[PDB]
Subunit: 292 residues, 4 copies
């Protein structure tokens, strides 16, 4: 659903930079077995920036097909041009996906009114649940709680993936939206704290390599067993952190290859191969989490 | 050249949001008459983000046509995917443009190495001069001086539009590159200071409405007459600031419409109409500059 | 104790800028009746910066005397010179105070090792419990969790007043210290969230004017009744915020005078009298909290 | 004058942490010989924070004595309490100092109005010229250009040591004040740029060890020979940066001891000894500058 450990899955690629079906199938099975709640296909971690709209749609359909109904698929549909966002959204209108993860327009820096207008129009062109995504450090703009409250009144807008790492925002948003509105963390290092404050889950990068643990940590947190949840979080912390020792998804794709979950760690420019020291660092975090 | 006052020209649109040729023609004649050094077609102020590649190409082509050789045209060709960037550049290869303004990949946040690989690849597949564009506030990433030093070694990469507003950068970059490498300000409010420290010009938003004063100011600065350049810069300061009271190009498009330079101030979503409060602030700035 | 609503009390002054005993007595009685847990005398809010060491000591002794054992008194003992801090601490060694609130050296910006050395020496010259105080925005330096863990091993160092507003720090510090180590919020706007994450109380400014409510909010939070705690927090939020509409303690001293708790709102330079719009703002927040 | 290279001189101490006259005498003779314009006695680099008012006065007095009229002395007289500032200034009234360097109140964070009241009061109770000192990184507060414009109207306030490193400030302040108001850099790494934009000098930390190069560099800059000034600035750059590898004055005191200029590099707590890693970094910077 839109609760628990939702994975922002990587798009495994062959040596040529094209989606590798075999590796994608392995990852999906892994998530189905590990207890992951849902899969966000072609989000930032899935290299949505270097995949054209057609390739993007292909990856989503393939994932949907490989999921075979065993696990829900949420599609990344963000764009910085309102017409473009609506257009990408419409490709999935009756695809089988359960909702869309749509980011605030990046680079062009619209006003809060622009942000509002942008999401309102997208929402009016689909029946699919829309989950807002705010990540000021990559977009150059920040969706404020007041605007979220406004947008939460649109029937189709059902939640938000908050990636600021600004924990005071959980309750500022909660105070303005209904209890039905879903609050998901967008920052692994603080997801547990986010949950202890009232969040409902996390759209995770760490979950790519430690799905079992992340799912367990989230269930406990959900049941209010924060003390035992912290133990898992402590084992994972070096991963929550070192997975960004280099531009995500560079560290997570290598970790995946290393773990034997994907065939290659190939990425598309401007993402480049992990450095040697980067390898050493990630390998240690893996060791510490007990995955290696 | 790639010196002096270069206008980051707006893309005039009708009520339907489609490019308006008559207004564009008017703007071009205005710059030819005011002494503007060159025109940057379809850059950030030209709404590159909301124009599809086909519209992007048509606008650049229309501009060349309307310019009729009277003023050089530089096309915005930035993308956050290297392959997309290369393709976009190939569509302009022998169009008649003098160079390309290429922005650091936004949103995906690549490393200094990725940034290096990105631009090197683009430069390798064209013969047009490349002008790098650094604006961390909008992209989420920063092209450091040392990376600029590496890139400047590529025959094709001839300059940089620096928009951090961090003036220590002028001499940090200046010392790492060749004497003929061009440094252009990308921040109107600090452009004269930038030029006083060693820069060669400015890719201006203010030049859209104060083309003549900007051209004189830059010429005075280039000649070392900073005191007399400061006088003009003081008249223009409110505009340098107020043109950003609301998300650019919202204030400047309104200002063009107000002066009778363009028919409408219509923009594409997520850009919204100027507020009444914005109208009065920009208007007062126009009077201060002596334009209305 | 070192739990619940601890007030960073203002130092009421006559028209001449000297402590007003009558007004101080009224405030202390108010806190005793309202259920405030403890009083931090001559802290930042109490204008420790404009009071010399002798006047500082006089205010503490007077407060201690007026408290008459009905409520614990913690004394502010911070200084940016280690010898000076030790010296001020020693004046209170057998005064009757229950502990000292000592801030990280301001202005001189020592290293983490310097911070460590600084608090270790102070602690070695007293038997009084020491509560560390980290407020990077006023001091220019930041005491990191790792250093806190180091210092928490010193028997005499018993807790920390965290005023960064950085909520991820509650559990980073908790992971490194014993469960006996006290974590107090130093930021009213986020104190409840701080408590929900594991904090034990708040050294509050808001408590100066809404002591009953703050004490109640803290007890509920302590008993795990966060939902009802939020209701009180919501009523107080405009106060948590507008109390800093001007340099603290300018807004809180006026609120105090307005409420009739102190005779005058006189402050010492560089603190200046509240502005008219400042008054209007604070008066509204008071209204909203139902105090006015 | 209040032009050129002005050294923010260190306060040499023996093993016990007491002021060492012999080393001070040596430093003063060094500046007299190297061409240093003036000496700032007991400023931030001189450990004003760990010296009591009596020690502060003795050091300033010793310096005047040892200077024996061969070089002007400016005393640091800043305090975060207006009354304390006024008193400190009165102790130097007819001492022979040429002016006072007075820092914006740190820690208590006053408003622009408070800042204005503070300096006006100080200026009113002395006849010595006042040089304002803005360093937000250490004080937690910022003296804006417009407040500087107000203060500059006070006969007595003659200049500002600007240490933000924000170069747009030069002309923002320049345009608000009288032609004879002095602008001094307080940031070594950006001092030449600051001077190139209109500043008159720099109150330097690097001048402690490279007095001669700094004096020539500033004279060249004052004469408009920026190219030849840049050459020297490049040699000195590693030092401009490395002298802050560890909390100033830790690196610079070590450097003085290393050159044989001072007997010991002892500091007072919270300042701690230089680390071995620091030793090697500063040493390499000394070789680069050609001093060792
Ligand atoms: K809704
Ligand atoms: K080149
Ligand atoms: K302890
Ligand atoms: K003056």
């Amino acid at each position: 659903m839109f609760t628990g450990s939702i994975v922002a899955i990587v798009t495994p690629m062959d040596e040529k930079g094209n989606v590798c079906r075999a590796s994608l199938k392995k990852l999906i099975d892994y998530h189905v077995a590990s207890g992951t709640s849902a899969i966000v296909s072609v989000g930032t971690t899935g290299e949505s920036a270097t995949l054209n709209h057609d390739e993007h749609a292909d990856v989503v359909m393939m994932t949907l097909d490989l999921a075979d109904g065993r696990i829900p698929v949420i599609a990344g549909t963000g764009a910085n041009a309102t017409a473009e966002a609506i257009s990408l959204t419409q490709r999935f209108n009756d695809s089988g996906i359960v909702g869309c993860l749509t980011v605030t327009p990046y680079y062009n820096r619209p006003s809060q009114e622009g942000l509002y207008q942008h999401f309102k129009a997208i929402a009016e062109h689909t029946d699919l649940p829309q989950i807002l995504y705010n990540v000021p450090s990559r977009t150059g703009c920040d969706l404020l709680p007041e605007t979220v409250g406004r947008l939460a009144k649109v029937k189709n807008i059902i939640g938000i993936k908050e990636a600021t790492g600004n924990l005071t925002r959980v309750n500022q948003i909660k105070e303005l939206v209904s209890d039905d509105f879903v609050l998901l963390s967008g920052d692994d290092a603080s997801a547990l704290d986010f949950m202890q404050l009232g969040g409902h889950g996390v759209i995770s990068v760490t979950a790519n390599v430690a799905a079992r643990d992340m799912a367990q940590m989230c269930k406990l947190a959900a049941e209010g067993h924060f003390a035992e949840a912290r133990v898992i979080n402590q084992r994972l912390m070096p991963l929550h952190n070192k997975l960004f020792v280099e531009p995500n998804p560079i560290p997570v794709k290598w970790a995946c290859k290393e773990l034997g979950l994907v065939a290659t760690d190939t990425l598309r420019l401007p993402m480049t191969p992990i450095t040697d020291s980067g390898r050493e660092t990630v390998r240690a975090a893996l060791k510490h989490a007990g995955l290696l």
